[PDB]
Design a binder for this molecule. Structure first.
Ligand SMILES: O=c1cc[nH]c(=O)[nH]1
Ligand SMILES: O=c1cc[nH]c(=O)[nH]1
Ligand SMILES: O=c1cc[nH]c(=O)[nH]1
Ligand SMILES: O=c1cc[nH]c(=O)[nH]1
Lengths: 224, 224, 224, 224
């Protein structure tokens, strides 16, 4: 049951960051998981959560000590964040998250990766990709709301790596995850970071997280 | 010069609707076309322009007529749009306009179509598509910022039609066009509606619109 | 009656610009005028309309001509707005419009003016005001969704003029007017410009425009 | 020293909730604090912060327990919120927060109150107010970014109280407070909750918090 879970993975996996389980967060989660929630509502709530999620994830970056001088002509000591970053959406669901990134980071560069599992073989292949030219030089915020089998995010990381990105500079921004998924990611790429809002029980006979949220891209974009 | 072309198209193509050429619109247009514009300014201004464009476009739908009684307790005669719609973006460039549609139309279903020209052969092939199941019964707001040779959009309409959408129900939303694209669209699919913001002079050697904007998707997403 | 009324204003006051009467514009108005409209919807649509209305009025500002060079190394000739502006809202209903204004012109300075119709008489009286320092030198986007008697706005212009604002530099943005309010404004301040989206028939003994919208401020902020 | 002050506030007033001092939060405050920051920049960050702050405050509301069933047919146990709420802004600075509140609570009723400290002396006097009439029955998101002497928020509290709002039903949303201010709020109305994002060191002869931000109202509204 729930509490065990978070305890184990939080314990076993030091690079995942779970968002504070506030009442609001649960409240939001409650609406988005409800199979009865109408489309307009699902996207309103998803977007909100998502913004919180990114603000959370943003803390994962390197920063500057910075001293400022206030209007009172007095000194203040802050921080300044300096890394070159960019967002990389996993098509199609991760796209739903680009909006929020763009909301807090205006004009961020946005890479895209469409990955698909063979209809027969089940193997995940890189179908299409469009990424910044110097991505090898920046911190990447990988976006995909779901991590069931870790099948998809793993292929994505793989390709980013072949492009020259450092494993430690990738920030996997997820909304919901299964333990399996979390383990695989760390198994293959222990140096990445993962921020998430929820970890569920397990995967369905069908490979669907449970109790879960269903097909996210479907409920978000309205193609269900 | 331009007024001619404008005239010619306005005359020869009854289904196109060029938008109001205001000094505001041109001012936006000048910012977005400038090679010197920074990604942030570029996205802000395109976003704004896009909003205006979607507003224009939505006027292309069928609407009822409606009497309402006001707080002053006197009836009022207005209209109501009663059709079932959805937006269909042409990946990737058409994606920048999804935000705008969602902004005026909360929770409108978003279909996606990825068309790509064979790298040897030059032709359009449908690569990926994820659309609404009842699309055959809806009004399609097709999104694609640019219309140079009309290759993409044309392949996009074909697929839509094989699914069952009514040709006269497709509303091709565009920012910038080149006369021949318009021409081609219309030779092949005469019953579609097209709303756009600018019509440019000619295409270039590279099939780039001129004086144009450059590569829209690259400038909007930052994979410059 | 409407047309005849619209045209007459139009022919009668060269300085008033009347928003384009699109079916969408009417759809929007019908929902906001409907007595039966829920508060969340009313704000949604009101905001929707405000954005278009604001975009319209911005066309009344001055501009230079600018030729830029496209990414395709070819010149484009557009224009640019060089102009120090600011919005001034009339508390409290006009505050519902500053959002729209801040949405299109980032960090635009905003002044506020609170006027109160005296209880004995009803002579408008200035309760409070906080405006830019250098306002004498700016174009003013004066904000007030309703213009019944024009008592509030005329008083507002009065003070603006007292501070040094040039009359011809005031752009009065509004959503709904009564012919009677229009006449007073231009009779008193012939040199200002006024952009509206609708003109209604009469005013009541309670000074409510009819068929009208009811109390805007209460409807928008939810204080019925 | 901050810690000290911070922890000491924390240990002393069971009822205040400080926002988690993330590096992000400090980066934001750093920008908005620098005298050197530009108008549009100040507003962008101030707004970004405010939204986080509001999400924080919303967790002070009461919630039910709720169970729904997932699209996969397995139940989930969430927690519904369900109370009549509303925001009340202290003009003019607090109105800078209504947007934030309106962003997450669609069409939330907004009340406004404007208070002036009488020159001569210094007792704030109520200048104007417009509130829901349903208010004695609601939870109130009282908004005011700076809390120096606390003279204003206490006066607002005083009128809300007079109107019949239950003291323990008032959530005071703040950005920067001064201990002295916090102290007066609790000595006068201890049953209230206060959510802030920062606690500075001292108030000065002209009553400005230090290191502080300067005048919030005019920096955000640009009337400085
Ligand atoms: O539960 C899951 C797993 C993968 N993708 C989804 O949308 N849902
Ligand atoms: O000019 C053109 C042609 C195709 N795609 C673009 O973005 N621009
Ligand atoms: O009808 C009217 C007239 C003035 N002000 C309003 O809010 N409504
Ligand atoms: O520092 C201060 C104190 C009060 N009000 C402000 O705007 N700033």
């Amino acid at each position: 049951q729930e509490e065990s879970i978070l305890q184990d993975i939080i314990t076993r996996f030091p690079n995942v960051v779970l968002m504070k389980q506030t009442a609001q967060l649960r409240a939001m989660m409650t609406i988005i998981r409800d199979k009865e929630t109408p489309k307009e509502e699902f996207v309103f709530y998803a977007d909100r959560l998502i913004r919180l999620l990114i603000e959370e994830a943003l803390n994962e970056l390197p920063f500057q000590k910075k001293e400022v001088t206030t209007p009172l002509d007095v000194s203040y000591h802050g921080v300044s964040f300096y890394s070159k970053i960019c967002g990389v959406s996993i098509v199609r669901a991760g796209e739903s998250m680009e909006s929020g990134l763009r909301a807090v980071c205006r004009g961020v560069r946005i890479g895209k990766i469409l990955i698909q599992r063979d209809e027969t073989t089940a193997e995940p292949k890189l179908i299409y990709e469009k990424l910044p030219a110097d991505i090898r030089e920046r911190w990447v915020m990988l976006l995909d709301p779901m991590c069931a089998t870790a099948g998809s995010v793993c292929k994505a990381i793989e390709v980013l790596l072949r492009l020259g990105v450092k494993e430690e500079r990738i920030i996997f921004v997820n909304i919901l995850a299964a333990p399996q998924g979390i383990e695989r990611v760390f198994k293959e790429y222990p140096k990445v970071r993962m921020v998430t809002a929820a970890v569920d029980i397990c995967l369905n006979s069908r490979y669907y997280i449970v109790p879960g949220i269903g097909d996210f891209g479907d409920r978000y974009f309205g193609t269900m």
